[PDB]
Amino acid sequence: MTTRMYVINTLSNMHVGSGEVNYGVIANLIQRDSVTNLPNINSSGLKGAIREYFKENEDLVRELFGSAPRDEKTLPGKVRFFEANLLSMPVRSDKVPFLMAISDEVLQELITKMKFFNCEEATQYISHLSTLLDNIKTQAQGTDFAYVFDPLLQGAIIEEVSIRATCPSHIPLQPSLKKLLGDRLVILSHKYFSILSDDNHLPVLSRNNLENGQSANLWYEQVLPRYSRLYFMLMDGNAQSEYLKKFRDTLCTPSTIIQIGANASIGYGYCQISELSPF
Template sequence: MKAHLYHIETISNLHVGSGEANEGVIDNLIQRDAITDLPVIHSSSLKGALREHFKTSKVVKYIFGSEANDTSCREAGAFRFFDARLLAVPVRSDKVPYLLATCPAVLKDYCDTIKLFGLKLTDDEKALLNLNAKKTYVVDGKYNGASIEDLDTCAVYNSTLVALSRFLGNSSVLVSDKDFKTLCDNDHLPVIARNYLDNGESKNLWYEQVLPRFSRLYFPVFIPDDTMFGEFQSTLTSSLIQIGGNATVGYGYCKLFLRKMNTND
């Protein structure tokens, strides 16, 4: 089997529910990684969403396996999907509507995943391993001094973050591991009020946590046969994919793309 790594860019707010009871203000929490406590899309949820996207494909059973209600022939899927881990989240700023924030621990986890799955790091990815964040840094000089609203701090331009700018774009910002966890905790991720109306009367008000649009995640997938890769790749990246709940109100629409590689890979 050969591993491939895909990036996910959320085009709309994403809610993949944890299914856990919550005694706090937020009724429906999103899924989180058991170790880092950062937002995640568990592999079962991701696989289910991709299967739905592939439902008209002739190779859906080969890739994903039999349907749960197919008792005639139980068959496991040939592809192996893994959790989609968080790479970056948007943060509000005074100089631009948002900056894309990440941190050294998340970038290291990303690079470690690449190596664990038998892939080679690009030159820019190798450079990401050397980053640290004693302050909050922006990669573009025009954002020097930009206020990061949720952290109540100002970012400083760092001319050495060229690799990060090529990786996430010129509107990216590097924060400390501690600050990144703060940005992703239950007090800082967006919470949206939802309401059920019956003849104009409110019958049920609840609060739902979301991963905000423009967030970035990544996931590896093992593909056993290169002859199937072309169709998998084209179907996966040719249109938006809906992941998680509330599709009818525009949640969870995502753009997927294969990890960019250079000649070192």
């Protein structure tokens, strides 16, 4: 009945359009945070996607998300949606197809956000993540780092930024932290993550428009890689317990897939919303 953390875990490519005026080759760019330039989803897009999924359940939509745009009478929604910040991203590797890349700065920002928002299971996650971050800083000692926690993953190569994965044996990764951040997790410096998540390294796809075999238009598209993880905060205010429980159970159902992003018909931005499990 308070602020809750949700994880997105996109199962496909995701393209949430900024609508910004492009200065380069990529016509369609993805939404990025103003301050940190990390990929993000606007709260309006999150609310739109979740309302689209639940649109059939009219009472739940009216109670939680509010009235329709054409409704003759307006009811404010009881649920407040926040921005979805990038948690982890898949990066190309050599021993494995990919690794889930996280940075120290995004971990610190997540800790600050949970402290500021006071999530449901905030305390244990804050304590364990703070201990992990302090151990990481103790082992790094001001140097650029890339730490794997699976012993088999030692010596892994991040392809885009040519760095090698080290294994600190005295830094334990708790199972809940693995469930939150992902499997085959790599913790590296935020400079490496910023380079990996910048415009020159995010996947760019060429697209065509053909009329009777003649190309009408050409443009390039930017997408967020599949299996990337994003987190947002949901504030319910104080909604009906039955509608809120229905919303949480439907969201956490393994068979529930939410479409966030532009290209729905060609399978862009299908995700599985998770809840912060108790530690």
